[PDB]
Amino acid sequence: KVFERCELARTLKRLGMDGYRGISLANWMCLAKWESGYNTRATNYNAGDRSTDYGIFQINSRYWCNDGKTPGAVNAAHLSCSALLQDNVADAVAAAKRVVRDPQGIRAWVAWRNRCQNRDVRQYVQGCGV
Protein backbone atom coordinates (compact mmCIF):
# COMPACT_ATOMS: atom_id res chain seq x y z
CA LYS A 1 0.00 0.00 0.00
CA VAL A 2 1.16 3.51 -0.86
CA PHE A 3 -0.12 5.87 1.90
CA GLU A 4 -1.31 9.38 1.34
CA ARG A 5 0.70 11.89 3.42
CA CYS A 6 -1.97 12.96 5.92
CA GLU A 7 -3.55 9.53 6.03
CA LEU A 8 -0.20 8.18 7.25
CA ALA A 9 0.34 11.03 9.79
CA ARG A 10 -2.95 10.28 11.57
CA THR A 11 -2.22 6.54 11.53
CA LEU A 12 1.18 6.94 13.17
CA LYS A 13 -0.25 9.36 15.76
CA ARG A 14 -2.94 6.86 16.70
CA LEU A 15 -0.15 4.26 17.03
CA GLY A 16 1.66 6.38 19.61
CA MET A 17 4.61 7.52 17.50
CA ASP A 18 4.31 11.21 18.31
CA GLY A 19 7.14 11.99 20.73
CA TYR A 20 8.17 8.36 21.10
CA ARG A 21 11.66 8.51 22.66
CA GLY A 22 11.81 12.26 21.93
CA ILE A 23 11.00 11.81 18.23
CA SER A 24 8.32 14.12 16.83
CA LEU A 25 5.72 12.85 14.38
CA ALA A 26 7.15 15.22 11.71
CA ASN A 27 10.46 13.35 11.98
CA TRP A 28 8.91 9.89 11.58
CA MET A 29 7.08 11.25 8.51
CA CYS A 30 10.31 12.67 7.09
CA LEU A 31 11.91 9.24 7.65
CA ALA A 32 9.08 7.25 5.92
CA LYS A 33 9.05 9.72 3.01
CA TRP A 34 12.75 9.32 2.21
CA GLU A 35 13.01 5.63 3.06
CA SER A 36 10.11 4.23 1.01
CA GLY A 37 7.97 7.06 -0.29
CA TYR A 38 5.25 5.87 2.14
CA ASN A 39 5.18 2.46 0.43
CA THR A 40 4.65 -0.58 2.69
CA ARG A 41 5.92 -3.12 0.13
CA ALA A 42 9.20 -1.33 -0.55
CA THR A 43 12.19 -3.70 -0.29
CA ASN A 44 15.85 -3.02 -1.02
CA TYR A 45 18.61 -5.59 -1.24
CA ASN A 46 22.08 -4.51 -0.12
CA ALA A 47 24.45 -6.49 -2.41
CA GLY A 48 27.42 -5.49 -0.29
CA ASP A 49 26.41 -7.17 2.99
CA ARG A 50 23.57 -9.44 1.81
CA SER A 51 20.89 -7.90 4.00
CA THR A 52 17.52 -6.49 2.89
CA ASP A 53 15.58 -3.41 4.07
CA TYR A 54 11.82 -4.04 4.41
CA GLY A 55 8.71 -1.89 4.42
CA ILE A 56 7.72 1.68 5.03
CA PHE A 57 10.61 2.33 7.45
CA GLN A 58 13.15 0.19 5.55
CA ILE A 59 13.90 -2.03 8.53
CA ASN A 60 17.03 -4.17 8.18
CA SER A 61 17.11 -8.00 8.20
CA ARG A 62 20.47 -8.31 9.96
CA TYR A 63 19.24 -6.81 13.21
CA TRP A 64 15.52 -6.25 13.44
CA CYS A 65 13.55 -8.87 11.55
CA ASN A 66 14.35 -12.36 10.31
CA ASP A 67 14.24 -13.39 6.65
CA GLY A 68 16.40 -16.53 6.90
CA LYS A 69 18.86 -15.63 4.15
CA THR A 70 20.87 -12.89 5.89
CA PRO A 71 24.37 -13.93 7.14
CA GLY A 72 25.17 -13.08 10.78
CA ALA A 73 21.57 -12.18 11.48
CA VAL A 74 19.91 -11.49 14.81
CA ASN A 75 16.25 -10.83 15.60
CA ALA A 76 16.19 -7.84 17.97
CA ALA A 77 12.63 -6.84 17.13
CA HIS A 78 11.79 -10.61 17.01
CA LEU A 79 9.60 -10.51 13.88
CA SER A 80 9.52 -12.15 10.47
CA CYS A 81 10.44 -9.57 7.79
CA SER A 82 7.25 -10.69 5.99
CA ALA A 83 5.21 -8.78 8.63
CA LEU A 84 6.82 -5.50 7.51
CA LEU A 85 5.35 -5.82 4.00
CA GLN A 86 1.69 -5.75 5.20
CA ASP A 87 -0.80 -2.96 4.43
CA ASN A 88 -1.40 -2.65 8.17
CA VAL A 89 1.67 -0.83 9.58
CA ALA A 90 1.17 -1.91 13.22
CA ASP A 91 4.07 -4.40 13.13
CA ALA A 92 6.38 -1.96 11.27
CA VAL A 93 5.64 0.65 13.95
CA ALA A 94 6.45 -1.77 16.77
CA ALA A 95 9.74 -2.64 15.01
CA ALA A 96 10.59 1.04 14.42
CA LYS A 97 10.00 1.74 18.14
CA ARG A 98 12.41 -1.11 18.97
CA VAL A 99 15.12 0.35 16.69
CA VAL A 100 15.02 3.72 18.47
CA ARG A 101 15.23 2.19 21.95
CA ASP A 102 18.94 1.73 21.24
CA PRO A 103 21.18 4.75 22.09
CA GLN A 104 21.49 5.92 18.43
CA GLY A 105 17.79 6.69 18.27
CA ILE A 106 16.45 8.05 14.98
CA ARG A 107 20.07 8.40 13.80
CA ALA A 108 20.08 4.65 13.10
CA TRP A 109 18.83 5.48 9.60
CA VAL A 110 21.50 7.34 7.64
CA ALA A 111 18.77 8.76 5.38
CA TRP A 112 17.37 10.63 8.40
CA ARG A 113 20.74 12.42 8.89
CA ASN A 114 21.01 13.40 5.21
CA ARG A 115 17.45 14.57 4.63
CA CYS A 116 15.75 15.36 7.96
CA GLN A 117 18.13 16.21 10.78
CA ASN A 118 18.52 19.97 11.44
CA ARG A 119 15.87 20.81 8.82
CA ASP A 120 12.39 22.38 8.90
CA VAL A 121 10.24 19.24 8.79
CA ARG A 122 6.86 20.84 9.55
CA GLN A 123 5.91 20.42 5.92
CA TYR A 124 5.47 16.67 6.50
CA VAL A 125 2.52 17.08 8.91
CA GLN A 126 1.05 20.44 7.92
CA GLY A 127 -2.65 20.36 7.16
CA CYS A 128 -3.10 16.82 8.48
CA GLY A 129 -4.92 17.57 11.71
CA VAL A 130 -2.32 15.97 14.02
User: What DSSP line would sit under 33-54, residue for residue?
Assistant: HHHHSSBTT-EEEETTTTEEEE
Measuring CA to CA, which residue among 15, 39, 16, 18 is closest to residue 28?
18
CA torsion 46-12-81-39 (nearest 10°) is -50
* Measured distance CA(6)–CA(4) in Å, rounded: 6
* Measured distance CA(67)–CA(15) in Å, rounded: 25
Looking at 7, 35, 87, 120, which residue is catalytic?
Answer: 35
CB 29 within 8 A of CB 10: no
Q: Which experiment gave this structure?
A: X-ray
What phi and psi, each to the nearest 5 degrees, are found at residue 114? -70, -40
Looking at 53, 67, 91, 120, which residue is catalytic?
Answer: 53
Burial class of 111 by CB neighbour count within 10 A (0 to 12, 13 to 18, 19+): middle
* Measured distance CA(21)–CA(34) in Å, rounded: 21
What domains can be seen in the chain, in order of their start residue?
1-130 (1.10.530.10)
| Encoded amino acid at 37, one letter | G
Is residue 4 annotated as part of the catalytic site, yes or no?
A: no
CB 93 within 8 A of CB 55: no
